[PDB]
Amino acid sequence: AKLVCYFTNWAQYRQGEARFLPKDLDPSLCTHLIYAFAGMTNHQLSTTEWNDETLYQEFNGLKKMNPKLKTLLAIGGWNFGTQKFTDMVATANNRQTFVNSAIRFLRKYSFDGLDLDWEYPGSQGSPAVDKERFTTLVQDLANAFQQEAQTSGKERLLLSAAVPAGQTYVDAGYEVDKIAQNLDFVNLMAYDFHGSWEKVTGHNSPLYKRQEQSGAAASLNVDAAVQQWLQKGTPASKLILGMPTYGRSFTLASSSDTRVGAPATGSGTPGPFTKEGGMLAYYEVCSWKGATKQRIQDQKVPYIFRDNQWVGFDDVESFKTKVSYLKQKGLGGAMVWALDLDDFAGFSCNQGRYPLIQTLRQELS
Numbered sequence: 001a002k003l004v005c006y007f008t009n010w011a012q013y014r015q016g017e018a019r020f021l022p023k024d025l026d027p028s029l030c031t032h033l034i035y036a037f038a039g040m041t042n043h044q045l046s047t048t049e050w051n052d053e054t055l056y057q058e059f060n061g062l063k064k065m066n067p068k069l070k071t072l073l074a075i076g077g078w079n080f081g082t083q084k085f086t087d088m089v090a091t092a093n094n095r096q097t098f099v100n101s102a103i104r105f106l107r108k109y110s111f112d113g114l115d116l117d118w119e120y121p122g123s124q125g126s127p128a129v130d131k132e133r134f135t136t137l138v139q140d141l142a143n144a145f146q147q148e149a150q151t152s153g154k155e156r157l158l159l160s161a162a163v164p165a166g167q168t169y170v171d172a173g174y175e176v177d178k179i180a181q182n183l184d185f186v187n188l189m190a191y192d193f194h195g196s197w198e199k200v201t202g203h204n205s206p207l208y209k210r211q212e213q214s215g216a217a218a219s220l221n222v223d224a225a226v227q228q229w230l231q232k233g234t235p236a237s238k239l240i241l242g243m244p245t246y247g248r249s250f251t252l253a254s255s256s257d258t259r260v261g262a263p264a265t266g267s268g269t270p271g272p273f274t275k276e277g278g279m280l281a282y283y284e285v286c287s288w289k290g291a292t293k294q295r296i297q298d299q300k301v302p303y304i305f306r307d308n309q310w311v312g313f314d315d316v317e318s319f320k321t322k323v324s325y326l327k328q329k330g331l332g333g334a335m336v337w338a339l340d341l342d343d344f345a346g347f348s349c350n351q352g353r354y355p356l357i358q359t360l361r362q363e364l365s
């Protein structure tokens with residue numbers, strides 16, 4: 001089974017014990033490590049931090065300690081946008097310029113593959129035409145990757161993509177059945193189902209829906225996301241189930257109504273280390289004494305509150321539940337975002353180093 005874990009090249013700027021660099025990485029924790037994120041300049045793959053080349057080397061150098069490990073470079077991301085993607089896949093000359101740079105870039109830095117993270121083709125400013133242009137991009141990469149392997153005589157470069165769970169987005173830009181044939185594995189983003197962008201508290205990653213949910217609202221859970229990608233044609237073994245080492249917070253309109261579905265006046269106080277209201281690292285949810293942990297029985301995930309602060313998150317338990325759920329589904333494995341937000345150095349949760357992902361590795365193996 002696969003355990004695809006994401007490293008992020010901006011965690012390095014967090015303060016104190018929250019700072020994360022390749023040295024905080026465990027070469028054996030995951031089967032595949034994906035480096036987030038690499039951008040694009042003139043239709044080509046490029047760095048995004050002043051020290052990506054140094055990081056790239058330490059990142060991939062980890063394979064000297066674990067030759068079984070596979071590393072990939074992720075291009076895109078939420079904040080990346082759609083512009084540069086839509087423009088790069090618009091002309092053959094551009095697609096080919098990108099592909100050739102991807103290959104040369106990945107090989108130069110010792111990456112084993114590329115993880116496409118276009119959020120998302122077919123929306124957010126992306127013309128519905130990009131739905132089929134994406135598919136072409138995938139085929140182009142796959143084809144070039146296959147050809148190169150034979151000429152260079154090296155392990156063929158791997159091709160993956162981070163994909164949305166929403167029904168609306170899959171229909172809008174993904175030719176599921178067709179891309180699945182060319183993607184070595186699909187990284188399903190089964191989270192962000194609920195967030196502070198809503199007026200009511202909801203869980204970031206509920207495994208199942210709540211009895212009181214119907215219609216489109218009943219699809220906002222992992223299972224729906226999974227059943228969906230399978231039905232549309234994804235071999236269960238290529239579908240990797242994503243899980244978050246972060247949770248989503250809300251500020252309660254009143255601390256008297258703390259249930260899931262209660263009135264939220266907006267995002268929760270930013271985390272002292274993550275400093276991005278509405279989300280929190282697992283290790284930030286740990287430093288909470290005097291809080292109250294619940295359990296959304298129907299969705300098999302927890303959440304905690306203290307005064308006007310409510311946060312739905314994942315713990316060692318829900319992670320075990322989820323690892324167990326995917327097994328039953330015959331999925332290819334688990335995906336986690338991000339190594340970065342777990343208690344990677346056992347400095348806050350008192351459960352050791354990488355409490356959550358370690359749970360994943362042990363449960364999966």
Ligand SMILES: C=NC1=N[C@@H]2[C@@H](O)[C@H](O[C@@H]3O[C@H](CO)[C@@H](O[C@@H]4O[C@H](CO)[C@@H](O)[C@@H](O)[C@H]4NC(C)=O)[C@@H](O)[C@H]3NC(C)=O)[C@@H](CO)[C@@H]2O1
Pocket residue numbers: 006010076077078079080117162187189192246274275276279337
């Ligand atoms: C598995 N792939 C995958 N891709 C999606 C990610 O985009 C997303 O995580 C979010 O990624 C954006 C960047 O695209 C991050 O933006 C960063 O936010 C911090 C504040 O927290 C800010 O200071 C900047 O460093 C900013 N950097 C950039 C390059 O914009 C975060 O918003 C990040 N969010 C979380 C909760 O990690 C994940 C999860 O939705 C998806 O998974």
